[PDB]
Amino acid sequence: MKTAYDVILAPVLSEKAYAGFAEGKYTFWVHPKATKTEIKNAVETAFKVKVVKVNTLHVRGKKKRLGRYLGKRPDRKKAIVQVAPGQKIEALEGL
Amino acid sequence: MRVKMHVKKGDTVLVASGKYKGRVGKVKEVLPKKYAVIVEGVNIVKKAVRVSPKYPQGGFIEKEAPLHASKVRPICPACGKPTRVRKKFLENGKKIRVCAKCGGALD
Amino acid sequence: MKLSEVRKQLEEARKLSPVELEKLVREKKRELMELRFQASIGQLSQNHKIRDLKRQIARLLTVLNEKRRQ
Amino acid sequence: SKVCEISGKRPIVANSIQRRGKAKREGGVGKKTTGISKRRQYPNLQKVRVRVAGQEITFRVAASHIPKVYELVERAKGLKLEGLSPKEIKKELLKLL
RNA sequence: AAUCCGCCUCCCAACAAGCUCUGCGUGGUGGGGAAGCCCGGGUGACAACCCCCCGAAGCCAGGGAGCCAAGAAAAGCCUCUAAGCACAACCUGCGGGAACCCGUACCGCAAACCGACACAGGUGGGCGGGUGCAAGAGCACUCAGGCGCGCGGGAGAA
RNA sequence: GAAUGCCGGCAUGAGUAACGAUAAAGAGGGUGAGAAUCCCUCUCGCCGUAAGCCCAAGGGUUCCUACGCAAUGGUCGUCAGCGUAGGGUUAGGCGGGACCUAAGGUGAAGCCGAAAGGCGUAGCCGAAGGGCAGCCGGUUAAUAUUCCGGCCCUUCCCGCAG
RNA sequence: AGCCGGUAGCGGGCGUGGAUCCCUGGAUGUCCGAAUGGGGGAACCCGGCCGGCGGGAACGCCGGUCACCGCGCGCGCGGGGGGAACCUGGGGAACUGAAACAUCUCAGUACCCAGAGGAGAGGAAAGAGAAAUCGACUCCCUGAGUAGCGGCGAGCGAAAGGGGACCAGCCUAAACCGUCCGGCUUGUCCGGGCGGGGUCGUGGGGCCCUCGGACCGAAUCCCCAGCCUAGCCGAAGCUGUUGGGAAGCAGCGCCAGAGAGGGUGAAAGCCCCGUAGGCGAAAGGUGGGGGGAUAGGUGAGGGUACCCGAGUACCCCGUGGUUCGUGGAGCCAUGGGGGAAUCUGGGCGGACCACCGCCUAAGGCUAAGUACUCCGGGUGACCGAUAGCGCACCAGUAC
Ligand SMILES: [Mg+2]
Ligand SMILES: [Mg+2]
Ligand SMILES: [Mg+2]
Ligand SMILES: [Mg+2]
Ligand SMILES: [Mg+2]
Ligand SMILES: [Mg+2]
Ligand SMILES: [Mg+2]
Ligand SMILES: [Mg+2]
Ligand SMILES: [Mg+2]
Ligand SMILES: [Mg+2]
Ligand SMILES: [Mg+2]
Ligand SMILES: [Mg+2]
Ligand SMILES: [Mg+2]
Ligand SMILES: [Mg+2]
Ligand SMILES: [Mg+2]
Ligand SMILES: [Mg+2]
Ligand SMILES: [Mg+2]
Ligand SMILES: [Mg+2]
Ligand SMILES: [Mg+2]
Ligand SMILES: [Mg+2]
Ligand SMILES: [Mg+2]
Ligand SMILES: [Mg+2]
Ligand SMILES: [Mg+2]
Ligand SMILES: [Mg+2]
Ligand SMILES: [Mg+2]
Ligand SMILES: [Mg+2]
Ligand SMILES: [Mg+2]
Ligand SMILES: [Mg+2]
Ligand SMILES: [Mg+2]
Ligand SMILES: [Mg+2]
Ligand SMILES: [Mg+2]
Ligand SMILES: [Mg+2]
Ligand SMILES: [Mg+2]
Ligand SMILES: [Mg+2]
Ligand SMILES: [Mg+2]
Ligand SMILES: [Mg+2]
Ligand SMILES: [Mg+2]
Ligand SMILES: [Mg+2]
Ligand SMILES: [Mg+2]
Ligand SMILES: [Mg+2]
Ligand SMILES: [Mg+2]
Ligand SMILES: [Mg+2]
Ligand SMILES: [Mg+2]
Ligand SMILES: [Mg+2]
Ligand SMILES: [Mg+2]
Ligand SMILES: [Mg+2]
Ligand SMILES: [Mg+2]
Ligand SMILES: [Mg+2]
Ligand SMILES: [Mg+2]
Ligand SMILES: [Mg+2]
Ligand SMILES: [Mg+2]
Ligand SMILES: [Mg+2]
Ligand SMILES: [Mg+2]
Ligand SMILES: [Mg+2]
Ligand SMILES: [Mg+2]
Ligand SMILES: [Mg+2]
Ligand SMILES: [Mg+2]
Ligand SMILES: [Mg+2]
Ligand SMILES: [Mg+2]
Ligand SMILES: [Mg+2]
Ligand SMILES: [Mg+2]
Ligand SMILES: [Mg+2]
Ligand SMILES: [Mg+2]
Ligand SMILES: [Mg+2]
Ligand SMILES: [Mg+2]
Ligand SMILES: [Mg+2]
Ligand SMILES: [Mg+2]
Ligand SMILES: [Mg+2]
Ligand SMILES: [Mg+2]
Ligand SMILES: [Mg+2]
Ligand SMILES: [Mg+2]
Ligand SMILES: [Mg+2]
Ligand SMILES: [Mg+2]
Ligand SMILES: [Mg+2]
Ligand SMILES: [Mg+2]
Ligand SMILES: [Mg+2]
Ligand SMILES: [Mg+2]
Ligand SMILES: [Mg+2]
Ligand SMILES: [Mg+2]
Ligand SMILES: [Mg+2]
Ligand SMILES: [Mg+2]
Ligand SMILES: [Mg+2]
Ligand SMILES: [Mg+2]
Ligand SMILES: [Mg+2]
Ligand SMILES: [Mg+2]
Ligand SMILES: [Mg+2]
Ligand SMILES: [Mg+2]
Ligand SMILES: [Mg+2]
Ligand SMILES: [Mg+2]
Ligand SMILES: [Mg+2]
Ligand SMILES: [Mg+2]
Ligand SMILES: [Mg+2]
Ligand SMILES: [Mg+2]
Ligand SMILES: [Mg+2]
Ligand SMILES: [Mg+2]
Ligand SMILES: [Mg+2]
Ligand SMILES: [Mg+2]
Ligand SMILES: [Mg+2]
Ligand SMILES: [Mg+2]
Ligand SMILES: [Mg+2]
Ligand SMILES: [Mg+2]
Ligand SMILES: [Mg+2]
Ligand SMILES: [Mg+2]
Ligand SMILES: [Mg+2]
Ligand SMILES: [Mg+2]
Ligand SMILES: [Mg+2]
Ligand SMILES: [Mg+2]
Ligand SMILES: [Mg+2]
Ligand SMILES: [Mg+2]
Ligand SMILES: [Mg+2]
Ligand SMILES: [Mg+2]
Ligand SMILES: [Mg+2]
Ligand SMILES: [Mg+2]
Ligand SMILES: [Mg+2]
Ligand SMILES: [Mg+2]
Ligand SMILES: [Mg+2]
Ligand SMILES: [Mg+2]
Ligand SMILES: [Mg+2]
Ligand SMILES: [Mg+2]
Ligand SMILES: [Mg+2]
Ligand SMILES: [Mg+2]
Ligand SMILES: [Mg+2]
Ligand SMILES: [Mg+2]
Ligand SMILES: [Mg+2]
Ligand SMILES: [Mg+2]
Ligand SMILES: [Mg+2]
Ligand SMILES: [Mg+2]
Ligand SMILES: [Mg+2]
Ligand SMILES: [Mg+2]
Ligand SMILES: [Mg+2]
Ligand SMILES: [Mg+2]
Ligand SMILES: [Mg+2]
Ligand SMILES: [Mg+2]
Ligand SMILES: [Mg+2]
Ligand SMILES: [Mg+2]
Ligand SMILES: [Mg+2]
Ligand SMILES: [Mg+2]
Ligand SMILES: [Mg+2]
Ligand SMILES: [Mg+2]
Ligand SMILES: [Mg+2]
Ligand SMILES: [Mg+2]
Ligand SMILES: [Mg+2]
Ligand SMILES: [Mg+2]
Ligand SMILES: [Mg+2]
Ligand SMILES: [Mg+2]
Ligand SMILES: [Mg+2]
Ligand SMILES: [Mg+2]
Ligand SMILES: [Mg+2]
Ligand SMILES: [Mg+2]
Ligand SMILES: [Mg+2]
Ligand SMILES: [Mg+2]
Ligand SMILES: [Mg+2]
Ligand SMILES: [Mg+2]
Ligand SMILES: [Mg+2]
Ligand SMILES: [Mg+2]
Ligand SMILES: [Mg+2]
Ligand SMILES: [Mg+2]
Ligand SMILES: [Mg+2]
Ligand SMILES: [Mg+2]
Ligand SMILES: [Mg+2]
Ligand SMILES: [Mg+2]
Ligand SMILES: [Mg+2]
Ligand SMILES: [Mg+2]
Ligand SMILES: [Mg+2]
Ligand SMILES: [Mg+2]
Ligand SMILES: [Mg+2]
Ligand SMILES: [Mg+2]
Ligand SMILES: [Mg+2]
Ligand SMILES: [Mg+2]
Ligand SMILES: [Mg+2]
Ligand SMILES: [Mg+2]
Ligand SMILES: [Mg+2]
Ligand SMILES: [Mg+2]
Ligand SMILES: [Mg+2]
Ligand SMILES: [Mg+2]
Ligand SMILES: [Mg+2]
Ligand SMILES: [Mg+2]
Ligand SMILES: [Mg+2]
Ligand SMILES: [Mg+2]
Ligand SMILES: [Mg+2]
Ligand SMILES: [Mg+2]
Ligand SMILES: [Mg+2]
Ligand SMILES: [Mg+2]
Ligand SMILES: [Mg+2]
Ligand SMILES: [Mg+2]
Ligand SMILES: [Mg+2]
Ligand SMILES: [Mg+2]
Ligand SMILES: [Mg+2]
Ligand SMILES: [Mg+2]
Ligand SMILES: [Mg+2]
Ligand SMILES: [Mg+2]
Ligand SMILES: [Mg+2]
Ligand SMILES: [Mg+2]
Ligand SMILES: [Mg+2]
Ligand SMILES: [Mg+2]
Ligand SMILES: [Mg+2]
Ligand SMILES: [Mg+2]
Ligand SMILES: [Mg+2]
Ligand SMILES: [Mg+2]
Ligand SMILES: [Mg+2]
Ligand SMILES: [Mg+2]
Ligand SMILES: [Mg+2]
Ligand SMILES: [Mg+2]
Ligand SMILES: [Mg+2]
Ligand SMILES: [Mg+2]
Ligand SMILES: [Mg+2]
Ligand SMILES: [Mg+2]
Ligand SMILES: [Mg+2]
Ligand SMILES: [Mg+2]
Ligand SMILES: [Mg+2]
Ligand SMILES: [Mg+2]
Ligand SMILES: [Mg+2]
Ligand SMILES: [Mg+2]
Ligand SMILES: [Mg+2]
Ligand SMILES: [Mg+2]
Ligand SMILES: [Mg+2]
Ligand SMILES: [Mg+2]
Ligand SMILES: [Mg+2]
Ligand SMILES: [Mg+2]
Ligand SMILES: [Mg+2]
Ligand SMILES: [Mg+2]
Ligand SMILES: [Mg+2]
Ligand SMILES: [Zn+2]
C-alpha cells in the first residue's frame, strides 16, 4: 500500500542541501515517478509541516565499472520542499 | 538439493589419512561447499598477517586448514571406535546416525 | 527476525482487521523510513533491522490480502 | 477479380501453353511446346443488387451462381429482417446457404 | 436558426475624431558601478550617472508603393444563434485558493558533434566593438575575450 | 613446405619515415622522487565577421572538487576531456507536452487485392509554422528568465458585486 | 545442521521451538510488449466514468473500469500474439543439369504467407483392377529403378499385390411426422428455427398394411491404479612401510543381487559420492491401463415408388495432379459455357461401343501406428580449448 513513506526515501546529504535549512528548504531523495503535488502531501503527512513550494529534478545515475563490467548506478529524483514561514523539520535540522 | 555430510559439528572424529592420520579431534566447522571439515588442532598452517589493528606486532598466526570430509571418520560415543555411519529410523519416527560396529547413536 | 517472533507476528496479524492491518503497515513503513534515515547518516549499526522491517511489512500486507481475498 | 460470395470460387493459377507443329493424329511429326507460363483464371464475378426487407443488398457473385442469390431471397421470407441494416441482412442471407 | 455575416436602399460620418492595440520615452521602486594599488575579494565610491552627434537589416507593423510568377491551414479570439436553460449560464471587476509532466550539468565551427585518430576536411541560427582605407560583414591593426596549434634542442650541406 | 592458403606468434625494413598547419617564443618563482611540457608572474607573438560570445542539432557526465599517473595523450607530465571517489542540473511565465493545424502519415464509412496486404472524404497524429503569461540584479566550486531580491503577469477553481 | 546467491570483507543477524536449501500450490507482480481507454519515436505521454485519499473545488495520487473483430439472445462467450524443428494449405524461383539452349531438369525444392497442434495430414470406397479378387486411412519393408514417362535426350519414375506396425468406426442432409415463429397471395400455403425419424450398396431409408418385444456400448464424463514434478535406505579393512600424501608395496582379513563410474594428497570393491537391490507424495500435472456411469446401439417379410446431398453430375473449352511432356489420354481436381436425373438413378474398370463386373459423388467427424527435438535423461572404437556449438570463460557480448 502506498504511503508518504514510500514517496520520501532519504534526505539529501550535501553542503548544498544543508545550506537550504536556514530558509526552510529541505531536500529529499524521492521516488522517481513521484509528482510535485504528491510530494507536498507526503512531506506534510510525514513531518507535520505546511508545504508552500516544491521543486524537483531528476538525477541520472553515474556510469561505473568494476574491472571488465560496465554498469550504471540507479537514476534518482530529488525534491526541494519549502515549508511555511516559521515552520521547521527537526529530523533534518539534524544535522 | 543438499551436500551429503556424514559428519557434523562437533562430533569427535578420527583423521584417517593425510599427514595427521590417526589423530582424533572435535569438528570445529563444516563447510559443505568445499566438502570439507575443520578439526581441532589438526592441519595447522602458518599464516602471514600484516601489522594491523587486528594484529599489532604482526608476524604469523596458526590456523586450522580444511580437511576433505572423506578423510574423516566419526568416533562412536558408545564403543569408542571409528566407524562408518548408518541410518536408523526411530519410533518418532525420525532418522538418526548410528555406529556400524556396535549400534549406538552418534547424534 | 527469530522464527518464534515471526510465528507470533503472523498469529496476531491474522486476528487484526483489514483496517488495523492498514494502520499497522502505515506505522511500520514510517519506522522503515526512520531506519533509512539513520542508515543514511551512518548511525545504524544494527543494519539487519532494515531487512527485518521490510519482511514484516510484506507479511502484514500478505495477511491483509488474505483477509480481503474472500 | 475476387471471390464469389456464394460459391467461394476464387482466382486460380493455370499455365498458358504455347504450341507449334502438326498433331500426330493429323499425320504430323507432333506438337512442340514453345513456351509455358503461369497466368490466372478469374471467376466470372458480377454485381447482383437485390431489394430485401426494404433494404438494398448487393452480392459479388460468379455468373454461375447468380440464380443462387435469388433463391436466398426467396428463402428469406421466413425471416425477421425488418429494421435490420443491410450488413445484417446480408449476413442472414448468407447464413441460409 | 440567427439580432451575426453577405447583398440592396436611405441617413449622419469620413486623408478627422473617437474607440482599441502595440512600440518608444518617462515613471513609485530595485539595481549596477571603472582605471589604479591593495591579498575571485577589498578599496576607489555618498562613485558620477549629464549634454551633443552618428544610427540600423531591429521596433511601431497586420505601415506604404510598385510588380507578376498572384503568394498555407487550423485553433486561440470575437460575433451569431440551436437544442437546452433562463434560482442557471456567460460577461466585467475584485478577492482567496489552485497551477501537473519531461528538459535544464558540460562540449557545441569543435580535442566532447560527422569523418577508425585529441584528424589542416564537414556542421544550421543570433551577437560580432574601435580606427583608417570612397562603401562594406572587404583589408590592416587593435578592444573585450581567446590562443601560441601536446616533442624538443642544435646546425646553417646537397 | 608451399595453395598471393587459415589462425597466432615473432622478425626485416630501422633507431629509419614520422610525431598532423611556419601564430613563436624567453626568463624568474613555485610544486615534486622526477619538470622545455603542471601552477604563478613579467616579457614576446597570434586570432579578433574570430581562433571571441550566445542558441539549435548531435554527444551523454565529458561539468565541479579531492586524491592519483599503469594505460590513454603522437614527447614529457607533478597536468588532462584519463583512473578512483564525492558533489553538481531547482521553472505556472524559457523549450516541449495536458492547444492548433502543414506536407505527409494514420484512418470511422467505403473500395480493392490468392495470403501477406494496397487504397480511402471525415476524424486523428504530425512543427523549427500559428497560438500562449518574466524582466533586471545578486548568489554557488559547480544551476539559475528555474534559487533569492525587487517589480510585473497568466490560466483554472470557488466566492462576492455589478 | 547449518545459513544470510555468485562473494571474501565491513557492519549486523538467523537456525533442532527445524533455518538456509529442494518440490508443489498460493500471494505480490512498476513499465513496455498481441498490448487492447486514447496517443506515441516500445518501456513515455494524455483522458472518460465510479469509488477513495489531501484543507481539496481547481491540482495530484490510489483502486476498479473503458480497444477492435466474430458468434450468440446492453450483456455473455470466443478471437488477436508467441513457439527450435516437425505438419497442412495458398503462392512459388534461380543457379545448376541437359557438357551450348528454349521443351525438359533443378523442384512444387529454396523462400514468402495463412493455419494447426503436441503432432499435423489422411481416413470408413461413386476405392482398387482382373484375382470368379481385395476391403477406411496412415507409416516401414518389398514389389522396383519394375510398369511406364521422356527435345524417347539429360533424366524422371508409379500402382496393385505380398510382408509388417497400428487397428475403429461414427454423426448428418432428404422422405415422413411434431411443434414454434412470420410472410400474405388465407391455406391441406410457402418459408425459417428446434425436436422426432434416418444414414445405406446382399442397395438403404420413408409411408402403409402384416407377424415378432433383453443384450451391445463409447472417441464423453467419474473414480482408481500407474507415471512426472522433491527425495530415501543401501554390504564389507585394519596394520606396517616408502613418501608431503598411499589408495603403491608387505601381512592378515572381509563384502558382493553391489568388482558401473566419479572422488579422496599417488594407483581404494570394503574412506567418500555412489552402484546392485529396494523405498517414497499432502500439493499440482498426467492417466492410452483398470473399474463405473452416460450418450448411442437392434426384427421379418409384403405392398407404395415418397427420399437418397445441384449450378452438381454430364458434354465442351482452358489448365492442374498422376509414371503420363497431347499422346490412342482414360482417371481425379476445376476457371468459362451449356446443363440432368433419384436406384428402371448414377460414377468407374485408360479413347469409343457392346457385354461382364466394381462402386455409391456433389455434408461432417474419427484414436492408434508416422514426423520433429526448444526441453529432461541415458549412452558413445564422438571432440578435448585453432578441436567440440559462433560461446567450456559474464557471447549472440566486445566490436
Ligand atoms: Mg502493492
Ligand atoms: Mg555551497
Ligand atoms: Mg497524494
Ligand atoms: Mg523542472
Ligand atoms: Mg545498479
Ligand atoms: Mg540425506
Ligand atoms: Mg591412509
Ligand atoms: Mg596410526
Ligand atoms: Mg522429518
Ligand atoms: Mg520468512
Ligand atoms: Mg492460353
Ligand atoms: Mg495428335
Ligand atoms: Mg494412324
Ligand atoms: Mg511434345
Ligand atoms: Mg465487376
Ligand atoms: Mg446485375
Ligand atoms: Mg461454370
Ligand atoms: Mg451457367
Ligand atoms: Mg438559413
Ligand atoms: Mg434585420
Ligand atoms: Mg451590429
Ligand atoms: Mg516603456
Ligand atoms: Mg509606460
Ligand atoms: Mg542608487
Ligand atoms: Mg563596483
Ligand atoms: Mg578593482
Ligand atoms: Mg563603501
Ligand atoms: Mg572614502
Ligand atoms: Mg563623491
Ligand atoms: Mg539589407
Ligand atoms: Mg502591406
Ligand atoms: Mg501571368
Ligand atoms: Mg486543412
Ligand atoms: Mg479541430
Ligand atoms: Mg427551447
Ligand atoms: Mg455582453
Ligand atoms: Mg488571481
Ligand atoms: Mg497530467
Ligand atoms: Mg522534471
Ligand atoms: Mg541550466
Ligand atoms: Mg548552461
Ligand atoms: Mg556553459
Ligand atoms: Mg573545447
Ligand atoms: Mg560554449
Ligand atoms: Mg570551418
Ligand atoms: Mg554558426
Ligand atoms: Mg568554442
Ligand atoms: Mg570523439
Ligand atoms: Mg572526433
Ligand atoms: Mg593536437
Ligand atoms: Mg578538427
Ligand atoms: Mg557554414
Ligand atoms: Mg557590441
Ligand atoms: Mg568607418
Ligand atoms: Mg583600401
Ligand atoms: Mg574601401
Ligand atoms: Mg569594421
Ligand atoms: Mg575579400
Ligand atoms: Mg578579415
Ligand atoms: Mg591576414
Ligand atoms: Mg582598439
Ligand atoms: Mg589579452
Ligand atoms: Mg607553436
Ligand atoms: Mg605540434
Ligand atoms: Mg610548444
Ligand atoms: Mg647541419
Ligand atoms: Mg609439396
Ligand atoms: Mg607474400
Ligand atoms: Mg602475403
Ligand atoms: Mg611476392
Ligand atoms: Mg598465408
Ligand atoms: Mg603454412
Ligand atoms: Mg593468414
Ligand atoms: Mg602473419
Ligand atoms: Mg632477424
Ligand atoms: Mg621490428
Ligand atoms: Mg641516427
Ligand atoms: Mg634507409
Ligand atoms: Mg634520413
Ligand atoms: Mg626526421
Ligand atoms: Mg608537415
Ligand atoms: Mg606542427
Ligand atoms: Mg620554470
Ligand atoms: Mg624552478
Ligand atoms: Mg615538464
Ligand atoms: Mg617530469
Ligand atoms: Mg601556467
Ligand atoms: Mg594581430
Ligand atoms: Mg573588428
Ligand atoms: Mg540535448
Ligand atoms: Mg560519442
Ligand atoms: Mg567517465
Ligand atoms: Mg557546470
Ligand atoms: Mg568529471
Ligand atoms: Mg575539467
Ligand atoms: Mg590535483
Ligand atoms: Mg599516465
Ligand atoms: Mg606517465
Ligand atoms: Mg609513468
Ligand atoms: Mg593504480
Ligand atoms: Mg600515450
Ligand atoms: Mg606518454
Ligand atoms: Mg595522436
Ligand atoms: Mg604527485
Ligand atoms: Mg585530456
Ligand atoms: Mg576525471
Ligand atoms: Mg565535493
Ligand atoms: Mg518563477
Ligand atoms: Mg507549455
Ligand atoms: Mg490537465
Ligand atoms: Mg496534441
Ligand atoms: Mg489535431
Ligand atoms: Mg473497414
Ligand atoms: Mg494505409
Ligand atoms: Mg488522407
Ligand atoms: Mg486533438
Ligand atoms: Mg498535434
Ligand atoms: Mg509548436
Ligand atoms: Mg512556435
Ligand atoms: Mg511560452
Ligand atoms: Mg516583465
Ligand atoms: Mg557554467
Ligand atoms: Mg551550481
Ligand atoms: Mg523570482
Ligand atoms: Mg450576480
Ligand atoms: Mg553479497
Ligand atoms: Mg564482520
Ligand atoms: Mg517438517
Ligand atoms: Mg512458486
Ligand atoms: Mg510504483
Ligand atoms: Mg502493459
Ligand atoms: Mg495502450
Ligand atoms: Mg494506437
Ligand atoms: Mg473523483
Ligand atoms: Mg496540506
Ligand atoms: Mg478531491
Ligand atoms: Mg486511476
Ligand atoms: Mg483510468
Ligand atoms: Mg490471426
Ligand atoms: Mg497460435
Ligand atoms: Mg503447397
Ligand atoms: Mg488460404
Ligand atoms: Mg502452388
Ligand atoms: Mg508450400
Ligand atoms: Mg517469381
Ligand atoms: Mg533454367
Ligand atoms: Mg546446382
Ligand atoms: Mg543437378
Ligand atoms: Mg549431369
Ligand atoms: Mg547447361
Ligand atoms: Mg555444361
Ligand atoms: Mg551458356
Ligand atoms: Mg536452363
Ligand atoms: Mg517439377
Ligand atoms: Mg526448409
Ligand atoms: Mg501461429
Ligand atoms: Mg504421438
Ligand atoms: Mg485431424
Ligand atoms: Mg460414408
Ligand atoms: Mg522382381
Ligand atoms: Mg518431377
Ligand atoms: Mg499397399
Ligand atoms: Mg499389406
Ligand atoms: Mg512398433
Ligand atoms: Mg480395420
Ligand atoms: Mg401463424
Ligand atoms: Mg421450408
Ligand atoms: Mg412447415
Ligand atoms: Mg418445421
Ligand atoms: Mg427399398
Ligand atoms: Mg463418438
Ligand atoms: Mg547411502
Ligand atoms: Mg558404503
Ligand atoms: Mg614420492
Ligand atoms: Mg613418513
Ligand atoms: Mg594404509
Ligand atoms: Mg594388499
Ligand atoms: Mg555392475
Ligand atoms: Mg571403478
Ligand atoms: Mg573409481
Ligand atoms: Mg591398481
Ligand atoms: Mg589406471
Ligand atoms: Mg574407488
Ligand atoms: Mg535401480
Ligand atoms: Mg536406486
Ligand atoms: Mg436399421
Ligand atoms: Mg421392412
Ligand atoms: Mg421416387
Ligand atoms: Mg450420395
Ligand atoms: Mg448444398
Ligand atoms: Mg477437362
Ligand atoms: Mg502434369
Ligand atoms: Mg495432363
Ligand atoms: Mg506418346
Ligand atoms: Mg492422362
Ligand atoms: Mg469410361
Ligand atoms: Mg471432370
Ligand atoms: Mg468448371
Ligand atoms: Mg444401378
Ligand atoms: Mg443410368
Ligand atoms: Mg466421374
Ligand atoms: Mg467421365
Ligand atoms: Mg475402377
Ligand atoms: Mg477397358
Ligand atoms: Mg452395365
Ligand atoms: Mg469400384
Ligand atoms: Mg479431416
Ligand atoms: Mg486408441
Ligand atoms: Mg491425433
Ligand atoms: Mg498418430
Ligand atoms: Mg522421436
Ligand atoms: Mg539432450
Ligand atoms: Mg581424443
Ligand atoms: Mg579425454
Ligand atoms: Mg584457447
Ligand atoms: Mg572454440
Ligand atoms: Mg593447450
Ligand atoms: Mg566451433
Ligand atoms: Mg551451449
Ligand atoms: Mg570460435
Ligand atoms: Mg571462443
Ligand atoms: Mg567478453
Ligand atoms: Zn559403536
PDB file of N, CA and C (backbone and C1' of nucleotides) in Angstrom, chain B residues 4 19 35 70-71 73 84 86-87, chain G residues 233 236-238 265 271-272 274:
ATOM      1  N   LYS B   4      25.713 -34.097   0.926  1.00  0.00           N
ATOM      2  CA  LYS B   4      25.639 -35.150   1.924  1.00  0.00           C
ATOM      3  C   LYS B   4      26.858 -35.122   2.834  1.00  0.00           C
ATOM      4  N   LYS B  19      48.841 -36.293   6.511  1.00  0.00           N
ATOM      5  CA  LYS B  19      49.911 -36.160   7.496  1.00  0.00           C
ATOM      6  C   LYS B  19      49.408 -36.352   8.934  1.00  0.00           C
ATOM      7  N   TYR B  35      33.082 -29.380   0.566  1.00  0.00           N
ATOM      8  CA  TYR B  35      33.071 -30.728   1.120  1.00  0.00           C
ATOM      9  C   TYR B  35      34.238 -30.890   2.082  1.00  0.00           C
ATOM     10  N   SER B  70      36.038 -36.682   3.415  1.00  0.00           N
ATOM     11  CA  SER B  70      36.118 -38.132   3.289  1.00  0.00           C
ATOM     12  C   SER B  70      37.299 -38.669   4.104  1.00  0.00           C
ATOM     13  N   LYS B  71      38.247 -37.789   4.436  1.00  0.00           N
ATOM     14  CA  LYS B  71      39.413 -38.162   5.247  1.00  0.00           C
ATOM     15  C   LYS B  71      39.081 -38.390   6.715  1.00  0.00           C
ATOM     16  N   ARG B  73      36.499 -39.742   9.992  1.00  0.00           N
ATOM     17  CA  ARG B  73      35.567 -40.787  10.435  1.00  0.00           C
ATOM     18  C   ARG B  73      35.086 -40.486  11.841  1.00  0.00           C
ATOM     19  N   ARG B  84      31.923 -46.244  10.180  1.00  0.00           N
ATOM     20  CA  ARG B  84      31.049 -45.708   9.149  1.00  0.00           C
ATOM     21  C   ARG B  84      29.715 -45.401   9.797  1.00  0.00           C
ATOM     22  N   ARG B  86      25.476 -45.408   9.770  1.00  0.00           N
ATOM     23  CA  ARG B  86      24.239 -45.969   9.265  1.00  0.00           C
ATOM     24  C   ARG B  86      23.097 -45.077   9.656  1.00  0.00           C
ATOM     25  N   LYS B  87      21.995 -45.194   8.937  1.00  0.00           N
ATOM     26  CA  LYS B  87      20.808 -44.502   9.344  1.00  0.00           C
ATOM     27  C   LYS B  87      19.897 -45.508  10.009  1.00  0.00           C
TER      28      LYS B  87
ATOM     29  P     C G 233      19.260 -41.756   3.512  1.00  0.00           P
ATOM     30  O5'   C G 233      19.000 -43.314   3.580  1.00  0.00           O
ATOM     31  C5'   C G 233      18.402 -43.899   4.711  1.00  0.00           C
ATOM     32  C4'   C G 233      18.153 -45.360   4.480  1.00  0.00           C
ATOM     33  C3'   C G 233      19.372 -46.205   4.172  1.00  0.00           C
ATOM     34  O3'   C G 233      20.128 -46.520   5.321  1.00  0.00           O
ATOM     35  C1'   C G 233      17.636 -46.772   2.690  1.00  0.00           C
ATOM     36  P     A G 236      28.563 -53.920   6.771  1.00  0.00           P
ATOM     37  O5'   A G 236      30.102 -54.247   6.577  1.00  0.00           O
ATOM     38  C5'   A G 236      30.577 -55.573   6.665  1.00  0.00           C
ATOM     39  C4'   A G 236      31.728 -55.782   5.725  1.00  0.00           C
ATOM     40  C3'   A G 236      32.862 -54.777   5.836  1.00  0.00           C
ATOM     41  O3'   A G 236      33.747 -55.069   6.896  1.00  0.00           O
ATOM     42  C1'   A G 236      32.319 -55.136   3.560  1.00  0.00           C
ATOM     43  P     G G 237      34.270 -53.907   7.863  1.00  0.00           P
ATOM     44  O5'   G G 237      35.150 -52.966   6.929  1.00  0.00           O
ATOM     45  C5'   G G 237      36.331 -53.439   6.307  1.00  0.00           C
ATOM     46  C4'   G G 237      37.553 -53.115   7.120  1.00  0.00           C
ATOM     47  C3'   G G 237      38.038 -51.661   7.082  1.00  0.00           C
ATOM     48  O3'   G G 237      38.623 -51.342   8.346  1.00  0.00           O
ATOM     49  C1'   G G 237      39.741 -53.085   6.324  1.00  0.00           C
ATOM     50  P     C G 238      38.449 -49.892   9.026  1.00  0.00           P
ATOM     51  O5'   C G 238      39.559 -49.890  10.159  1.00  0.00           O
ATOM     52  C5'   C G 238      40.924 -49.800   9.818  1.00  0.00           C
ATOM     53  C4'   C G 238      41.738 -50.878  10.478  1.00  0.00           C
ATOM     54  C3'   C G 238      43.229 -50.606  10.525  1.00  0.00           C
ATOM     55  O3'   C G 238      43.583 -49.757  11.591  1.00  0.00           O
ATOM     56  C1'   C G 238      42.871 -52.789   9.725  1.00  0.00           C
ATOM     57  P     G G 265      43.101 -35.620  -0.109  1.00  0.00           P
ATOM     58  O5'   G G 265      44.038 -35.976  -1.354  1.00  0.00           O
ATOM     59  C5'   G G 265      44.353 -35.018  -2.351  1.00  0.00           C
ATOM     60  C4'   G G 265      45.810 -35.076  -2.735  1.00  0.00           C
ATOM     61  C3'   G G 265      46.346 -36.474  -3.033  1.00  0.00           C
ATOM     62  O3'   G G 265      47.407 -36.390  -3.985  1.00  0.00           O
ATOM     63  C1'   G G 265      47.454 -35.583  -1.130  1.00  0.00           C
ATOM     64  P     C G 271      36.087 -48.676   4.241  1.00  0.00           P
ATOM     65  O5'   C G 271      35.659 -47.168   4.406  1.00  0.00           O
ATOM     66  C5'   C G 271      35.993 -46.434   5.560  1.00  0.00           C
ATOM     67  C4'   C G 271      36.169 -44.992   5.201  1.00  0.00           C
ATOM     68  C3'   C G 271      35.084 -44.415   4.317  1.00  0.00           C
ATOM     69  O3'   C G 271      33.926 -44.052   5.047  1.00  0.00           O
ATOM     70  C1'   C G 271      37.200 -43.833   3.454  1.00  0.00           C
ATOM     71  P     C G 272      32.478 -44.078   4.364  1.00  0.00           P
ATOM     72  O5'   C G 272      32.508 -42.847   3.367  1.00  0.00           O
ATOM     73  C5'   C G 272      32.705 -41.527   3.835  1.00  0.00           C
ATOM     74  C4'   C G 272      32.745 -40.576   2.674  1.00  0.00           C
ATOM     75  C3'   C G 272      31.575 -40.674   1.715  1.00  0.00           C
ATOM     76  O3'   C G 272      30.423 -39.983   2.164  1.00  0.00           O
ATOM     77  C1'   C G 272      33.600 -40.645   0.498  1.00  0.00           C
ATOM     78  P     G G 274      25.110 -40.226  -2.250  1.00  0.00           P
ATOM     79  O5'   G G 274      24.980 -40.790  -3.736  1.00  0.00           O
ATOM     80  C5'   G G 274      24.796 -42.173  -3.995  1.00  0.00           C
ATOM     81  C4'   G G 274      25.637 -42.601  -5.169  1.00  0.00           C
ATOM     82  C3'   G G 274      25.245 -43.894  -5.862  1.00  0.00           C
ATOM     83  O3'   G G 274      24.179 -43.713  -6.778  1.00  0.00           O
ATOM     84  C1'   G G 274      27.571 -43.878  -5.481  1.00  0.00           C
TER      85        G G 274
END
